[PDB]
Design a protein around this ligand. Structure first.
Ligand SMILES: CC(C)C[C@H](N)C(=O)NS(=O)(=O)OC[C@H]1O[C@@H](n2cnc3c(N)ncnc32)[C@H](O)[C@@H]1O
Ligand SMILES: CCC[C@H](N)C(=O)N[C@@H]1[C@H](O)[C@@H](CO)O[C@H]1n1cnc2c(N)ncnc21
Ligand SMILES: [Mg+2]
Ligand SMILES: [Zn+2]
Length: 860
RNA sequence: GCCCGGAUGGUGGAAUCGGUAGACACAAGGGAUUAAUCCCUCGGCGCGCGCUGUGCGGGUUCAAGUCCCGCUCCGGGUACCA
């Protein structure tokens, strides 16, 4: 062992030992107890950033911790290879998307190995290979035959000149980010999977997931949005077709003064032939972007349709209106509007001067005041004909039964959750196995023709997909006649919805899953990822597990037992507009900045000379070009230093703002650990520790060693608060530094401490601890060595601290024996001069005493 | 807009079940050997003391960073970024 700590010589040597001896490669061992520690697989963007490093350091800490407890730990790593960013970069760099992705996988694999995460590299998966996507294609065709797949029309962003589908990200400030023209909605047929079939199952099973956080669960409940209500049907005067509308407040039905409808309705098109102003409004709604954010934020405009719907109960003609806020997707694409008891409809009725009818009494039983706002609260009916006097429950059922009896109404469970649309029209994705014959009939691709392989060797113009551009690729022969297979590709969430299952048997050529291997590992014990995936991915993740369960592939009802949603690693984001209106995102390292007195950014230039637009802090990504590469810091300070800093800076779940300051404390700390072991082991071997032959200084030191083990085991195991665990070890290291190591009992005690401390740091800093474990002469490799257990006899306290307050404010602190009564604490508290100062000339009104913790004397 | 989080010294954070606010670190200042290491000071205002202090305004309690009511600002998601 050298005196100086040199990471460059140590770390690469230890990583080679793990690869050659195959330390973290594991099989389905029936003797050992299993632990599946899963981190979410990355998109191969190009470089890693500190967002990636935080995610995988957390998982490797848990995987190494659980390994030391004596369990067969599976920590897999793969690649979510398909995606949009591969296509844009391929055209820009003059390559195909396939080789761009494999080079990024090659680069990032090296970075992960250099960081030294104990992964099972034998179970590696690239989702862009046909070995992977063959089984989801096979699963999709099986899903179609069960009746869980269907085709329908859906709104899509469409740049009209180029004639290509754009994503939400590619639209910016109205116009399209490539060319100068406004983006429009286009109705296009697409494949959907019936996730709403499993709506109640996904919703109700959140109760069983007790080890998931309430942040994620409450978000999913509100996303699914189950809702029991009534679909009311209407007739129109000079129009044949009926208008059906959904509502959760049928009690307020007698106060319905008008009806609102979305722009893409048959009634709106019928009326727009004669009416020129309505025709102008419908063509304006093309510019409405496909996103809930910009749909709600815009001003709630509208125009009168002209047609008059007949209110079934009152018999009154009410005007139909067009509107922006009326979603085509949610409900029936049409609503009853009660402005008297809905804040959205009140604003609409106030603007355009529609009738505002009050039909619900206030809490007191008096008529409502609707001069300022609507009365959203539920109550007793008035101004409702026969339904007057009824409460909310009776009014709901009475108007439901009436409209059911009339035959223009029905009770229905409605979900906010829509069906999962999986058709994309880009190249770099798994092809959808569906075939349109010469007949005209559409049917699944047969089993002999699976997998429908995507051709990797291609050239891309940028506008159209090469598989779509070439008409020869689509050709095939099914049922003894020509046919055209689907050129649309899958959503990238499809590949990430079952990758966790495929890790159990990735080289299994027989089917989608080997059930012996799958049921051994599954369900997942801990699933670590971003809070960014709270809803979207995690809902598909769960949904897809239930489909595989119903297929008879897996036993468990839920895929993951525990979820650890780490906070986002944030960073500043800057950009300047290019020559042809293209957003060039500049990195914070390049950007020269002039700050405010408070800290906020005011101006923003770069090295060249562009006025950069500051878009606040945001998550690190290649999209906004604000990711910070760990390769510089790893080569400077070492992987262990980088890893330790990410865990020490903040607790896992909390959102971190990235900063370079703090890294030097981790490097200095590892030098202090190295120095203390160097000075200890240089003296030589040690004697056997006599437990009951120690001084009070030696007894107290050993108490702190075992108390740190109890804290660090709890902080990692239960709490996942790694910053408090690392801080607890830093305290113990400072006490061990000050402790003298002269005699036999001192060095015997120092052996026990250093063996414990090196084991507790092994999860965080595995490279340095592997080296130090051999120098302390421990049994075998540290990776397989057992986790330290605290001794209950060693941690016994003789006395306890007690704080002495006077009217809440602290005046004294005293040491008192553990087994001590309230009177004994009061007597000791009286002897203190700072306590007795505020007790003179005043009476003790009340005495509060927390056993062995606090005393608060309330004084007049 | 809607849903879910966050705000604590110059800085990242600790206080685990309402009970000592600032552990453990970084940055800064000064000292001590002669880049590296070890010491000292470190929320604010006026001392081996007193008041005050956890984004802003109220409230409950013997006691509030923690619980309650009303806001501000900052982040995540918002169905084609992954
Ligand atoms: C399952 C599948 C849908 C996952 C998908 N392939 C994916 O997300 N790929 S990835 O490359 O963007 O990320 C991989 C992991 O890293 C986390 N992460 C990313 N950015 C940050 C950040 N700024 N801060 C913290 N964590 C981040 C992210 O949540 C994920 O767990
Ligand atoms: C309180 C007065 C009645 C009120 N006016 C009402 O009918 N509300 C509908 C229902 O009560 C609620 C369910 O979430 O959303 C509304 N709703 C139903 N479909 C849609 C849609 N497509 N778009 C926007 N909101 C909708
Ligand atoms: Mg602050
Ligand atoms: Zn365009």
């Amino acid at each position: 062992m050298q005196e100086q700590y040199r990471p460059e010589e140590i770390e690469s040597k230890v990583q080679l030992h793990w690869d050659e001896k195959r330390t973290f490669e594991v099989t389905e061992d029936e003797s050992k107890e299993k632990y599946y520690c899963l981190s979410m697989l990355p998109y191969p963007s190009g470089r890693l950033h500190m967002g990636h490093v935080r995610n995988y350091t957390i998982g490797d800490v848990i995987a190494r911790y659980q390994r030391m407890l004596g369990k067969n730990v599976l920590q897999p790593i793969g690649w979510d290879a398909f995606g949009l960013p591969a296509e844009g970069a391929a055209v820009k760099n003059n390559t195909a998307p396939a080789p761009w992705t494999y080079d990024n996988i090659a680069y990032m694999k090296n970075q992960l190995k250099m960081l030294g995460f104990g992964y099972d590299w034998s179970r590696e998966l690239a989702t862009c290979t046909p070995e992977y996507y063959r089984w989801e294609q096979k699963f999709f065709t099986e899903l179609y035959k069960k009746g869980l797949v269907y085709k329908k029309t859906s709104a899509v962003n469409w740049c009209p000149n180029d004639q290509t589908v754009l994503a939400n990200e590619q639209v910016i400030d109205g116009c399209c980010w490539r060319c100068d023209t406004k983006v429009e909605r286009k109705e296009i047929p697409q494949w959907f999977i019936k996730i709403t079939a499993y709506a109640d199952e996904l919703l109700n099973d959140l109760d069983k997931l007790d080890h998931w956080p309430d942040t994620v669960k409450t978000m999913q409940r509100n996303w699914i949005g189950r809702s029991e209500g009534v679909e009311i049907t209407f007739n129109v005067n000079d129009y044949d077709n009926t208008l059906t509308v959904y509502t959760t407040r049928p009690d307020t039905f007698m106060g319905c003064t008008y009806l609102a409808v979305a722009a893409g309705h048959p009634l709106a098109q019928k009326a727009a032939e004669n009416n020129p102003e309505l025709a102008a409004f419908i063509d304006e709604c093309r510019n409405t972007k496909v996103a809930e954010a910009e749909m709600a934020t815009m001003e709630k405009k509208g125009v009168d349709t002209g047609f008059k719907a007949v209110h079934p109960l009152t018999g009154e003609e009410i005007p139909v209106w067009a509107a922006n806020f009326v979603l085509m997707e949610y409900g029936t694409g049409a609503v009853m509007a009660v402005p008297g008891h809905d804040q959205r409809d009140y604003e609409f009725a106030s603007k355009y001067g529609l009738n505002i009818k009050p039909v619900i009494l206030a809490a007191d039983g008096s008529e409502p005041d609707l001069s300022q706002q609507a009365l959203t609260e539920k109550g007793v009916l008035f101004n409702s004909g026969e339904f007057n006097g009824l409460d909310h429950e009776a009014a709901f059922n009475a108007i439901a039964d009436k409209l059911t009896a009339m035959g223009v109404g029905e009770r229905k469970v409605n979900y906010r959750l829509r069906d999962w649309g999986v058709s994309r029209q880009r190249y770099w994705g798994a092809p959808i196995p569906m075939v349109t014959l010469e007949d005209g009939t559409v049917m699944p691709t047969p089993d002999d023709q699976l997998p429908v392989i995507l051709p990797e060797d291609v050239v891309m113009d940028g506008i159209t997909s090469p598989i779509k551009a070439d008409p020869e690729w689509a050709k095939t022969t099914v049922n003894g006649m020509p046919a055209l297979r689907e050129t649309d590709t899958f959503d990238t969430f499809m590949e990430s919805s079952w990758y966790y299952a495929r890790y159990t048997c990735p080289q299994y050529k027989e089917g989608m899953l080997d059930s012996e291997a799958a049921n051994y590992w599954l369900p997942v014990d801990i699933y670590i990822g971003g809070i960014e995936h709270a809803i979207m991915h995690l809902l598909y993740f769960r949904f897809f597990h239930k489909l595989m369960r119903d297929a008879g592939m897996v036993n468990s009802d839920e895929p993951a037992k525990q979820l650890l949603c780490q906070g986002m690693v944030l960073a500043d984001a800057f950009y300047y507009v290019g020559e042809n209106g293209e957003r060039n995102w500049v990195s914070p390292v390049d950007a020269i900045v002039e700050r405010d007195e408070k800290g906020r950014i005011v101006k923003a230039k770069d090295a060249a000379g562009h006025e950069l637009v500051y878009t606040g802090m945001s998550k690190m990504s290649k999209s906004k070009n604000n990711g910070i590469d760990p390769q510089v810091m790893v080569e400077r300070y070492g992987a262990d230093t980088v890893r330790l800093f990410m865990m020490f800076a903040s607790p896992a779940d909390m959102t971190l703002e990235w900063q370079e300051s703090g890294v030097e404390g981790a490097n200095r700390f590892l030098k202090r650990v190295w120095k203390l072991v160097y000075e200890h082991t240089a003296k030589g071997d040690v004697a056997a520790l006599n437990v009951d032959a120690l001084t009070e200084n030696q007894k107290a030191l050993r108490r702190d060693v075992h108390k740190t083990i109890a804290k660090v085991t709890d902080d990692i195991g239960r709490r996942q608060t790694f910053n408090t665990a690392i801080a607890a070890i830093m305290e113990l290291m400072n006490k061990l530094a000050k402790a003298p190591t002269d005699g036999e009992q001192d060095r015997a005690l120092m052996q026990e401490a250093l063996l414990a401390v090196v084991r507790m740091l092994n999860p965080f800093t595995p490279h340095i601890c592997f080296t130090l474990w051999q120098e302390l002469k421990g049994e075998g490799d540290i990776d397989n060595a057992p986790w330290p257990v605290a001794d209950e006899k060693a941690m016994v306290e003789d006395s306890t601290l007690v704080v002495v307050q006077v009217n809440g404010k602290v005046r004294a602190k005293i040491t008192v024996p553990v087994d001590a009564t309230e009177e004994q604490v009061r007597e000791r508290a009286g002897q203190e001069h700072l306590v007795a100062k505020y007790l003179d000339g005043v009476t003790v009104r009340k005495v509060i005493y927390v056993p062995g913790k606090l005393l608060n004397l309330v004084v007049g």
